[PDB]
């Protein structure tokens, strides 16, 4: 159950948001 | 090579608009920042169209043309005092779509094309970005009528990362600022259409 | 004398030679008296006007579609509007009819590229008059009621009068050097099986549907004399451009739908009445 | 507008546009069909793949492969009603035994048959084999090599062979009925064994009498997702 | 201090530093996996070895070899996100029978699958085999030779094929999802039989788009004695 | 005529040709129309700045380690001390992080040789001042408190001031022409199996641990002005020398530890939501 | 074109080549990257005072 990321850290296109710097 | 085949009609340049320097958002570096931390990151051209410098005349041709090839140049200007010290690294990752979360460390940055900024000397750095993409063109804009099968406006990623943390003296400033500037060295546009607002 | 033969070499044995290829080498044994004798094409041979390649067949003009243009059709109105994809005519319904030569032959390949040519024949007389605008629209499509969106693309305006025909090369403007076919590479369904999501999930590939459209809009409303017809038919022909390309042989998307009967043993299978 | 530049040669030099090149790559006819020594042999009518061998949902079950009609070269042959020259047949025997399997060429005799057949409805053919009657024959020895490729000549009276008819099962003038083939290829075993058969055009091969594209149907769209789910 | 003299050529002239030379030596993918004739065939996605095929302790069991990720060439391909050209697949059938096993090439259709699959979820494929649909095919006859080496072309729309993604199981834009392969290689038997599969780069092959080294882990120290007991 | 062919030769049949080798001969069959056709690299080809060999990757500078240097650090004190072995970073603990290019690539080979280059970048300003001594120590190692032992080896003293960087070539001085890798050639353990002596006894080989060390000691104590920081970080970069050599391909000692997910069947395996 | 290859020859298959002999021909496959690469005796080689034969 990891088929898409949570909405807090994502840009519509179901990828890591450019705003969310803490991903690293 | 692929340009003449991919587009039956000729491609166009608008050097007066696109090949000028344009500043983007300011970057804050603090003493709290650790090595490998992202200070900023940019998915290009997307982020230079619809987030940073949205009213720039550099963005005007992207309204009408659907495709293009893009070679960029990015200057970085730092302003820390002589009693501070630290190292920042800026690097580029070509065709980064769904591969931003891997090979994304300081070590990967040192391997890929990059520039190094000392925060005390305030040396300027200029990284050159060629067009290295798995297709002939990159798409400029999404649209309601357009397909969602191809994610547009991203052929590369730029990372600004801490190499060595910012340090300061007793009763010194706990932060300092860096300003990026961008320009297209070679922006060829293809596939004319009706003008639309950017994102 | 009977001296020993010391010559030798390592070999890799294969059952067939040049089995996958259309050209090169062959190990075929002739069922003839003379093993190197071949068929003579001295008198009886292929005629010079016959097509030699699939691209030659694609260069034949074929009637794709038709539409009507009347005096009631107000300015800016879409007379014609289609996704011009040589892979498939429809994405959302079955096709049955006389497909064009270039579409038939393109159905044999997984990839296509290069410009596509159109020709609009107006079935009219000298007393018919009007103007239309042909437009090639890529990536982003126009609204039906917004003529201005169509005008901003690659267009050709035709003044209908004494001349009753106009040619139009549709440019190839895409993000890739070639486009993959929207039809399937392989389809084992033969008996019109009722499809489900599991069948689609276990398909050969994913259909990359084209958003590239060709449209024809009214510029000046058709104003014929009272003595002639108020509405005319327009025939839309299509063929591959001079630099049309095809690659990647696959299962044919189209197959005969009329007068299909499999062969039987003649005369064993009840031919003797 | 500009004609642009061709994509031919950009990806690779492996051009696949030539009609002859398309017809020279093989088509499976029979997929694991039985040879029985009680019969004369398994007959293969010498003709290229076309609408003549097309399966239609509902009709009687044959030994032929169902997707012959949907091959590129079958679609090409549906455009040309004339063909002249040799065909090449790749036959694979599903065995590793030392028994010889003979492949006999019969020239144009006027009939058109396929599959296992008792010639003149006898019940014994080991004493009177077709391969030992005088006709041109070649043997397969599976222990050595289970496959073979044989090239059959254009031994016929006619200038061209007829590719197809409107109705393949219509009982019309008997001499004209047989002009769609140039002979037969007959496979005879010792003991019961299975085989597979491919066909392709020879090097010495031509097509002519262009008929243009026929009326067709497709339902490929229905068995695939789009790029937007 | 002095730069000294290189050791290259001292021991032998067999240089193993060239990237292309490392990628051209084979990697085992599948070690004794079953082919079943109830399916269309065993699919092999045309892509080089990389982190995409890496095993992680705890995750679901696949048919892939576990140590693909730890091969030299997999480690090299983790540095380059672009590749163009042909790959070569060495397939060995564990048999000595006379049954033909067909290997069919499918060009870039947009999907990405591996293992046994029923295409369009049917329950019969002997009458409609993938190898007799029209696509390019080659046969293995184990009685003659149980092994084969086939070279698959770069039949795709894209300039480069994408080597890897950050997450291989992420459901993103479907057209982009399939750009990590350039097609498929499908193995179809007559009867149930096992096979083994290797992969290597072709002669016509290039890599580009250098990404540098990723974050890694090792525990090799723990499973070895030192030179001081 | 049908004359007999008396020519013959003895042969040794092999199933594959050039199976172990990376170059030479191949018996590969092209899945193409034309059997001798190849991929075109006329327009799309490898960029000239890209590395062509493993040695080219080893020539890229990579950040190995970091250490702090303060005004409290008395003279003779070890600021830095490590066994410089490109095979393994540690012999007595697990590693997890961003390994340098030359270490990553050296992990693919059983043997290495030639000098190793280091670069010490002092993250400081003009108001920082001090002196350190870099020393390459072979066979015999120095005591932590005995600076004189380090001084007797191959050394380079750096006066920190306006210049904030120093290069250091580490000589190759060993009893053998090459050194074998301390990592394993093959390790079938995949599921973090709890090791015992029997497992170690049945290992692939024996780890020949290096005693060669690089150290950095204080010569003159760091004496910065009161207005600036009293402690600075020093970045230690590493790469292979110009005559760095590698040989004997093996199982990679390093493997990805972040965002590792195996591939699944798309779209059969629950992609359709 | 795909013309037929009519060239052929009779052969006698043997499992090993030059198995009994100390010299002549060999069908040995090198376990190397380069299949024709050999050991270098440029620096390290047999000393001249060492015996070359049993005699």
Could you outline the blueprint of secondary structure elements for this entry?
The structure is cut from a larger assembly and holds 1 copy of chain A (24 residues), 1 copy of chain B (199 residues), 3 copies of chain C and 2 copies of chain D (229 residues).
Chain A: no helix or strand
Chain B: H1 3-6, H2 15-18, E1 22-23, E2 27-30, E3 38-45, H3 46-50, E4 65-79, E5 85-94, H4 106-111, E6 114-118, E7 125-129, E8 138-139, E9 154-167, E10 175-192
Chain D: H1 19-23, E1 27-35, E2 41-45, H2 72-77, E3 80-93, E4 101-107, E5 115-117, E6 137-140, E7 147-152, E8 161-162, H3 174-177, E9 183-188, E10 193-210, E11 216-218
Subcellular location (chains C, F): Host cytoplasm; Host membrane; Virion
Organism (chains C, F): Sacbrood virus
Protein name (chains C, F): Genome polyprotein
Structural class of chain D: mainly beta
Give the CA-CA distance, first to last residue of chain D. 36 Å
The total tally of domains of chain D equals 1
Total strand segments of chain D: 11
Most strands sheet of chain A:
none
Proportion of residues in helical segments of chain A: under 10%
PDB class: virus
Keywords: empty particle, icosahedral virus particle, iflavirus, virus
Entry title: Sacbrood virus of honeybee empty particle
Chain A: minor capsid protein MiCP
Characterization of the model:
The structure is cut from a larger assembly and holds 1 copy of chain A (24 residues), 1 copy of chain B (199 residues), 3 copies of chain C and 2 copies of chain D (229 residues). In chain A, 0% of the residues lie in helices and 0% in strands. Chain A has 24 residues and is mostly loops. The radius of gyration of chain A is 8 Å and the shape is globular. Chain B has helices at residues 3-6, 15-18, 46-50, 106-111, and strands spanning 22-23, 27-30, 38-45, 65-79, 85-94, 114-118, 125-129, 138-139, 154-167, 175-192. Chain C has one domain. In chain C, the strands form 3 sheets. Chain C has a 4-stranded antiparallel sheet with strand order 3-13-7-10. Chain C has a 4-stranded antiparallel sheet with strand order 4-12-8-9. Chain C is elongated, with a radius of gyration of 27 Å. Chains C and D meet through strand 2, helix 1, strand 5, helix 4 and strand 14 of C and helix 1, helix 2, strand 3, strand 7 and strand 10 of D. Strand 1 of chain C pairs parallel with strand 1 of chain F, so a sheet runs across the interface.
């Amino acid at each position: 159950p990891h088929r898409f990321l949570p909405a807090n850290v994502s840009n519509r296109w179901n990828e890591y948001s450019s705003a969310y710097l803490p991903r690293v | 090579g692929d340009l003449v085949i991919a587009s039956s009609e000729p491609t166009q340049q608008f050097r007066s608009l696109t090949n000028r320097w344009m500043p983007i958002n300011s970057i804050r570096v603090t003493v709290n920042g650790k090595r490998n931390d992202l200070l900023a990151q940019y998915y290009i051209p997307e982020d230079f169209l619809s987030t940073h410098a949205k009213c720039a005349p550099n963005t005007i041709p992207f309204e009408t043309y659907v495709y293009g090839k893009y070679e960029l140049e990015m200057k970085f200007v730092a302003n820390g005092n002589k009693f501070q010290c630290g190292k920042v690294i800026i690097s580029v990752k070509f065709d980064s779509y769904q591969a931003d979360n891997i090979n994304t460390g300081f070590q990967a940055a040192l391997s890929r094309p990059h520039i190094m900024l000392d925060l005390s000397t305030n040396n300027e750095g200029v990284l050159k970005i060629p067009f290295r993409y798995h297709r002939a063109f990159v798409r400029n804009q999404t649209h309601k009528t357009a397909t969602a099968g191809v994610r547009p406006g991203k052929f590369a990623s730029i990372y600004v990362q801490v190499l060595s943390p910012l340090q300061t003296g007793e009763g010194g400033a706990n932060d300092m600022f860096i300003r990026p500037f961008y320009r297209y060295t070679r922006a060829e546009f293809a596939g004319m259409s009706y003008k639309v607002p950017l994102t | 004398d009977k001296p020993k033969d010391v010559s030798s070499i390592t070999i890799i044995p294969k059952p067939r030679l040049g089995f996958p290829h259309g050209k090169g080498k062959s190990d075929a044994v002739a069922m003839r008296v003379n093993p190197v004798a071949l068929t003579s094409f001295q008198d009886v041979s292929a005629y010079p006007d016959e097509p030699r390649t699939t691209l030659d067949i694609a260069r034949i003009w074929g009637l794709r579609s038709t539409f009507n243009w009347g005096s009631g059709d107000e300015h800016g109105k879409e007379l014609f509007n289609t996704v011009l994809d040589p892979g498939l005519r429809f994405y959302d319904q079955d096709y049955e009819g006389q497909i064009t030569p270039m579409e038939y032959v393109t159905g044999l390949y997984n990839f296509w590229s290069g410009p596509i040519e159109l020709r609009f024949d107006f079935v009219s007389n000298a007393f018919h008059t009007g103007t239309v605008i042909i437009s090639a629209e890529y990536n982003r499509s126009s609204t039906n009621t917004d003529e201005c969106q169509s005008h901003s693309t690659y267009t050709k305006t035709f003044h209908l009068g004494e001349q009753k025909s106009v040619h139009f090369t549709v440019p190839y403007i895409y993000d890739t050097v070639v486009r993959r076919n929207t039809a399937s590479a392989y389809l084992p369904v033969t008996d019109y099986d009722k499809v489900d999501n599991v069948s689609r999930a276990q398909a050969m590939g994913i259909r990359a549907e084209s958003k590239m459209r060709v449209k024809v809009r009214v510029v000046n409303v058709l104003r014929p004399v009272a003595s002639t017809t108020s509405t005319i038919e327009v025939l839309v022909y299509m063929r591959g451009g001079k630099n049309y390309a095809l690659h990647g042989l696959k299962q044919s998307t189209y197959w005969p739908s009329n007068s299909v009967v499999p062969i039987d043993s003649f005369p064993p299978d009840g031919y003797d009445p | 507008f500009s004609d642009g530049v061709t994509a031919m040669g950009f990806q690779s030099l492996d051009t696949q546009v030539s009609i002859k090149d398309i017809l020279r790559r093989p088509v499976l006819l029979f997929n694991h069909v039985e040879l029985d020594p009680d019969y004369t042999g398994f007959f293969i009518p010498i003709m290229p793949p076309s609408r003549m061998m097309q399966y239609k949902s509902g009709d009687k079950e044959t030994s032929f492969q169902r997707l012959i009609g949907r091959t590129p070269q079958a679609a090409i042959m549906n455009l040309f009603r004339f063909w002249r020259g040799s065909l090449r047949y790749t036959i694979i025997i599903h065995s590793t035994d030392g028994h010889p399997i003979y492949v006999t060429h019969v020239p144009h005799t006027g009939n058109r048959v396929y599959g296992l057949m008792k010639v003149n409805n006898l019940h014994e053919y080991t004493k009177v084999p077709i391969f030992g009657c005088g006709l041109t024959t070649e043997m397969i020895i599976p222990s050595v090599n289970p496959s073979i490729c044989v090239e059959v000549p254009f031994d016929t009276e006619n200038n061209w062979a007829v590719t197809f008819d409107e109705d393949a099962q219509r009982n019309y003038s008997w001499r004209d009925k047989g002009d769609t083939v140039t002979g037969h290829l007959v496979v005879t075993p010792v003991v019961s064994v299975y085989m597979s058969v491919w066909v392709e055009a020879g090097d010495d091969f031509e097509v002519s009498n262009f008929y243009g594209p026929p009326s067709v149907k497709t339902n490929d769209w229905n068995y695939a997702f789009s790029d937007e789910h």
